[PDB]
Design a protein around this ligand. Structure first.
Ligand code: HEM
Ligand code: HEM
Ligand SMILES: N=C(Nc1cccc(COC[C@@H]2C[C@H](OCc3cccc(NC(=N)c4cccs4)c3)CN2)c1)c1cccs1
Ligand SMILES: N=C(Nc1cccc(COC[C@@H]2C[C@H](OCc3cccc(NC(=N)c4cccs4)c3)CN2)c1)c1cccs1
Ligand SMILES: C[C@H](O)[C@H](O)[C@H]1CNc2nc(N)[nH]c(=O)c2N1
Ligand SMILES: C[C@H](O)[C@H](O)[C@H]1CNc2nc(N)[nH]c(=O)c2N1
Ligand SMILES: [Zn+2]
Lengths: 404, 402
């Protein structure tokens, strides 16, 4: 056979070989001695080679590879790096790179959508106040009264000696998590640290389970500033169940727009430290992880009690039955509100289509099996039966250290 | 750098130092992770041998003793003269427990110290393999009070064929490929079914026909042996509250006994060494019954439950799966046959991880295999980082003998 990873689908019996992994310039956490794939978190001349590589990728995607426009852009990029130490992307290069970073994200099941991304160019932004305006506009555009649209807003790149643009919040929409006297948490335990930072920076805290946090925005070399989102901008969905009439009484809800704001977008060696992006939810993110993780809202026991299940024994499958109904409530409620959402069956089926598309387009697709397989009903989805090869390609979305 | 290992639910951290003991390369490199893939001289043997003998004497706290030193010399003298050696029965017993302990895909390892080892190395014919297999089954089944066991047949030797059990499990349901595309019975067993027929077996035509065994002594055609129906305990499937469920005519066997893996101890290889324990309910309820390329019963069950089958977003698949798993658990409990649910199993695996941390400084585990196939993040193992690596003694895959 070919000298490339052989990838098998065990449901269908089909085989492919990944040749794209050959284009990986960056090491992962694994070695011949041990596999670390389950771990969550495992320049000068350097810039120029990353830049040359990215420009070659751009010129391939417009089919002008080896041409005069291609050779002039390279010379232009090295001249700029030569005199300034950095360089700058053309508008169309940024748009290409941002889509390629999404397309490249091994943990993302939503990649069938990768070609459809609204790129807002905010590289002119010069204050925390203006970042706020740009973010409001992003939310308005992306939310679109419930018919959600993928979008990314790109703020100025990191630059020699000058401080970064940073959004401190991990998402544009987050519920407060208030540490209680009895050591427990009201609201979202995930958000305890950012909540306390918000208070330290002068926010007057509420005391509910679903208080929307303000934003902490940091323009270069300045302390962050606090901004409250106008509530009419933040679309939320009250949760009800289609047949269990009491589920509405629980007063649970979730926000419509997942908008990740703490990741670094790297393109051609350029680092965009503030570049929030949004799409729509897969229903298990809300119904399984957010609401049922023991370290999150942890509502499984409450719902099972309402359903009159035997919570005293594992073999009743009370957890499984409750999680299913919570997921159904999420789907039903979003549908009723006409807010875009995708169930884990439709998402994974679309992802199998994406795999095939990318096999033909590029000879493979980097994918992180543990993240792609949904957290309920894994083997009921077609991705469970699909082998996957994980590797890092650039442009990339990367984790970056918290700014405090 | 040793790997840092984090539990994301509890915020706790360990460091795996056991992986430094690994001698065998896995599928991954720095360029790319292949973790989700299902399939992969005399001084070489001598150093795996000594290393294993060192493991054994250290296990009995007798390291460096006269017994230890003279055993190293026996092994050495035997390899030098013959190019191979033989294990003492107590070493074999220790090696087989260690192979199980070391299996990264096994969620049931809290049990690893409790294994009945049948030494069948004095086996010289497929007939004799049959008798040993019958006694294993009878012992392991124990009227539903299942007991883990391994029977070890003679090791591979340079100048001859292997002893092999052709079937992948001791109990397997037939799969009959229909002229019109489909399979009757278990589609995973189409090929072994056809092999049995071709070796003279008279086939049935139901969905749950227990296959005969194809047993092979070195360099001989395999022979066919029908298991006595009374030896194969089976559990009819019914549901605690859904009465139409029993009408599905579904059933599974009590005893999961794997018979196609190679057991490697101290550089010696045992090509026939079937082993058995008990089922985790999701193996039957989720995989064997609901995989699309297995019995694929989700639609039938959803229709019986009157669910909306036209749309993914009714979560009909998730609902039928749950009830099927419940049926399995309820039916085994009612038949008084040992079974473990995925919540209990994964809780005990967390305890195992902690035991192994204290005892050995790590534990090789394969996350994709440890996390159950329904309700993943509802179990504690989902939130647990894991480090996968090959320790020896080991169970390995081997080529099919046909
Ligand atoms: C269009 C609808 C989309 C769906 C349904 C979706 C689905 C998901 C899901 C479920 C995750 C895992 C999240 C978690 O477990 O916390 C994920 C990861 C990710 N997605 Fe998407 N995605 C979508 C669009 C996007 C867009 C527009 C981008 C960026 C342009 C994006 C980039 C990412 C990245 C970078 C990750 C990985 C985050 C990490 O490693 O922590 N996706 N996607
Ligand atoms: C005592 C009760 C036991 C339980 C509940 C249990 C549970 C499991 C489960 C659920 C799997 C995954 C199986 C699959 O998806 O097909 C597995 C894998 C495995 N277990 Fe166990 N186990 C038990 C005892 C044993 C014993 C006695 C041995 C051998 C002595 C063993 C060795 C293995 C091996 C080698 C694998 C991996 C097979 C492969 O890689 O294909 N386990 N265990
Ligand atoms: N449907 C969606 N879901 C979605 C998609 C992506 C991400 C998320 C939520 O994020 C998942 C969480 C978010 C979380 O990452 C955030 C995080 C927290 C704390 C520290 C760091 N940084 C570091 N680890 C470092 C320290 C030093 C060097 S690096 C990163 C991991 N896991 C949801 C969409 C969002 C946007 C478009 S689709
Ligand atoms: N509860 C249990 N379940 C259990 C435990 C272990 C295994 C199983 C079922 O087996 C898992 C199946 C078994 C199967 O692996 C065996 C396999 C499949 C395909 C090919 C090859 N071999 C090759 N291609 C090679 C060519 C050259 C070198 S190799 C091997 C995957 N998936 C059930 C227990 C059984 C015994 C004690 S507990
Ligand atoms: C330990 C493990 O890597 C971790 O819990 C992962 C598993 N798979 C996941 N998959 C997704 N989509 N999101 C996650 O946060 C996680 N968590
Ligand atoms: C492609 C993927 O690795 C494959 O479907 C694996 C996933 N996890 C599994 N886990 C167990 N326990 N058994 C299996 O057969 C599998 N199959
Ligand atoms: Zn790996």
């Amino acid at each position: 056979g070919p000298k490339f990873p052989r990838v098998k689908n065990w449901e269908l019996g089909s085989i492919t070989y990944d040749t794209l992994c050959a284009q990986s310039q960056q090491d992962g956490p694994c070695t011949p001695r041990r596999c670390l794939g389950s771990l969550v978190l495992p320049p000068a001349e350097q810039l120029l080679s990353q830049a040359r590589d990215f420009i070659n990728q751009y010129y391939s995607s417009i089919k002008r590879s080896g041409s005069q426009a291609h050779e002039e852009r390279l010379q232009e990029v090295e001249a700029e790096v030569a005199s300034t130490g950095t360089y700058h992307l053309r508008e169309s290069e940024l748009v290409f790179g941002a889509k390629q970073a999404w397309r490249n994200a091994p943990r993302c099941v939503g990649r069938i959508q990768w070609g459809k991304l609204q790129v807002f160019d905010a590289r002119d932004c010069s204050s925390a106040q203006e970042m706020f305006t740009y973010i409001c506009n992003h939310i308005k555009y992306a939310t679109n009264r419930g018919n959600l649209r993928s979008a990314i807003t790109v703020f100025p790149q990191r630059a020699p000696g000058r401080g970064d643009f940073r959004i401190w919040n991990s998402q544009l929409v987050r519920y407060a998590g208030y540490r209680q006297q009895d050591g427990s948490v009201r609201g979202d335990p995930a958000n305890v640290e950012i909540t306390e930072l918000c208070i330290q920076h002068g926010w007057t805290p509420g005391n509910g389970r679903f208080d929307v946090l303000p934003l902490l925005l940091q323009a270069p070399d300045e302390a962050p500033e606090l901004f409250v989102l106008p509530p009419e901008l933040v679309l939320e969905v009250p949760l009800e169940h289609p047949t269990l009439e009491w589920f509405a009484a629980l007063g649970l809800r979730w926000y419509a727009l997942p908008a990740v704001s703490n990741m670094l977008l790297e393109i051609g060696g350029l680092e965009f430290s503030a570049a929030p992006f949004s799409g729509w939810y897969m229903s298990t993110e809300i119904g399984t992880r957010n609401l049922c993780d023991p370290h999150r809202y942890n509502i499984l026991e409450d719902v099972a009690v309402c359903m009159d299940l035997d919570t005293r024994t594992t073999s009743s499958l009370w957890k499984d039955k409750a999680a299913v109904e919570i997921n159904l409530a999420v789907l039903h409620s979003f549908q009723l509100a006409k807010v875009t959402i995708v169930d884990h069956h439709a998402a994974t089926v679309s992802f199998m289509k994406h795999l095939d598309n990318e096999q033909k387009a590029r000879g493979g697709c980097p994918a992180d099996w543990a993240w792609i397989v949904p957290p309920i009903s894994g083997s009921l989805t077609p991705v469970f039966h699909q082998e996957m090869v994980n590797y890092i390609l650039s442009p990339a979305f990367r984790y970056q250290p918290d700014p405090w």
